[PDB]
Amino acid sequence: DRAATRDAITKQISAQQNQAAATQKFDDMQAEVGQRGIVDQLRTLSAEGRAGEVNQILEIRKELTGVQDAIQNRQYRAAGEQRAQAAANRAAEAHSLSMAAGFTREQRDELRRDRDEAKLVSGTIATTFQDYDESRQAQSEIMRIVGKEVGMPTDDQGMPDMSRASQDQLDAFSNALNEAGVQANTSPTERRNAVLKSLVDAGVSSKGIAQAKQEMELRESLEGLAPQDRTKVEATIGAVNAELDTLQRTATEDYEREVARNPFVEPDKDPLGSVNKIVDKAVKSGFGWEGDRQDLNNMLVDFATNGIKLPDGRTAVVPSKLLEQAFNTTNTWLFKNAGDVEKRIIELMTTDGMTQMREDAPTIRENFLKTVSDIANQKRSNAVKVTRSAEREKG
């Protein structure tokens, strides 16, 4: 548990509560309390994935090949995006842990703050849209009932067809609206300002506000499109983002392989419980500490918790397999006292190649974070440009 005093906690903590609320709301929505729709998986992680799920809800070899190709492309893109996001989250957590040596915000927590603001924006927008959808369906019930009562050309969804509805056809709906209902449906403006206020309540930099406004314009444009036109637009967006996706995924495999090579770039809390077995290797037919197994365990967990005092004047946490290979010598009789083993680990951590790898780890970590941030920014930028160009061209 944490016993630290919050005190002012002006930033990164109100955002923490807001992101906790967003996560619990997403979990509750995914749990599907009661009976609802979502026949398919309906992950709704992103706009492209949500459009793919909607399509899933919806000569012969032509369509047989086309449907399969669409499914394969959508699944590949979504899997790549989600794996990249998870890897970036893990890398950001590792970078924050590494920087937390020594509320000490600096550039690392600045990057953390902007990424968390983006995550908060995305979660809040998804929650707002999900909440709106239920009201849309509830009101569409009455739109369909009224349309059937007066009688308009309708399809499986029940709402009168936009293309087939003439002015006289829409006159029945106008008369019904004049009669009762009073459903203004003006939310497409009020909505975003409300969200803005919530963001103002949370505290967001101008970049996050711009991202939220762009998400509003693109989401409203997408909602205004017909299902077929919406699918066409989202698939064109996927095509124009394909090269960015390929660059992002390739960078992710490169950086995760580098992580697999480097323990310093990614620590782990599991080996904190592993070190005990190494203690056993100091006892079985071996001359180690003079009956100081508890002392050895305490000093090893301290070293794996706070780190060794590097001679340069810094403190670095020793990883697991480097520690065990340092302990595993040709004959254990050489390493008996605590001073000897700490001198051994100190001199081994000061290896030239090991040192170079140590200061290489944060650089590659921050490069990975910067690259994924730039990839996301470029994806959003090309998406907003294409969507606004299409909207202008249509009308």
Add this chain to the structure above:
Amino acid sequence: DRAATRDAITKQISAQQNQAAATQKFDDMQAEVGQRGIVDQLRTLSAEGRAGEVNQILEIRKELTGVQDAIQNRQYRAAGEQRAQAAANRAAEAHSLSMAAGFTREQRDELRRDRDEAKLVSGTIATTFQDYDESRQAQSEIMRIVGKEVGMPTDDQGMPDMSRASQDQLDAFSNALNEAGVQANTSPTERRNAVLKSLVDAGVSSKGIAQAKQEMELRESLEGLAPQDRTKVEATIGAVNAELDTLQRTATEDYEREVARNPFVEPDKDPLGSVNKIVDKAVKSGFGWEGDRQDLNNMLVDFATNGIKLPDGRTAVVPSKLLEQAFNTTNTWLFKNAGDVEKRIIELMTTDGMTQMREDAPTIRENFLKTVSDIANQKRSNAVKVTRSAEREKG
């Protein structure tokens, strides 16, 4: 493990990281993460093999014999090429190990460097094409959807037929492009310059750059061809390379038989653990070392690791079966002390025929390497000439 200090490592190490990245990317692509295409094996080792796999994806006795003949010829050529490549790789590794006696680059590592540059070029180009293919399919989804919407003559692939598409037919695609999409697809230029920069990042001699440019021109020409015309062109390339393939394969059997004859041309790390059994033959009813089994093992592994001091002033590593036949005499009582057995092996390695075979091994090894390099260069040269001539003749 290796504890050497990298320090500058300007060459052959950045290339090492790049080739490691290429190999892991190839392994990941071959693993087929998730669901994708590639109904057949789809090895995609070379252009000819990839074309054969594509054909595999695609009176009566006429076609029955023709398909079988095509499959047999393609399989034979691909198997010969891959076996030759593997044998050449093993020979190059053995030559590097032999030269490493005594970062000592010389002509052997110059040949290694140029071969590694060629391998890096091939791997990077294959990875770039594989990455591009997914985007091509994703965008072809929308091209097919739009073409079906407006309505062009189409086949199982879904894209409108090039020959059947008139100017008026392509006017629908032009209007759709003016409408939305904004898919420039200008990569066929930017792509290669990007690769060039990566090569500039890696560090490549001018010959490698020329090879990469030729691979670009031939790959783009192949991509521009129709499937039937592409098959015709690749089969003509195989026919014009058939004599080079025959020369290459015959040279490979000759040189691998010579390797089977000569241990000096190809050592092995396995007998390093085998020598121990010979030690047993020195104990069972035999007068050998005076209780120095560990000393004998240490001296034998040293001899098989660093080599014996030849009287000429050089150091050569003794092979396995020559060693065991040196030890296996008519009566083991003659060879008891270490000095006697080392004198025996020294005088046996100085045999006139054995010596001649010793200096014959590197010569035949480098001849094999030069021959395979020339075969590859001539194959690429005739391929580029035929492809450019065909491209000029078509248009």
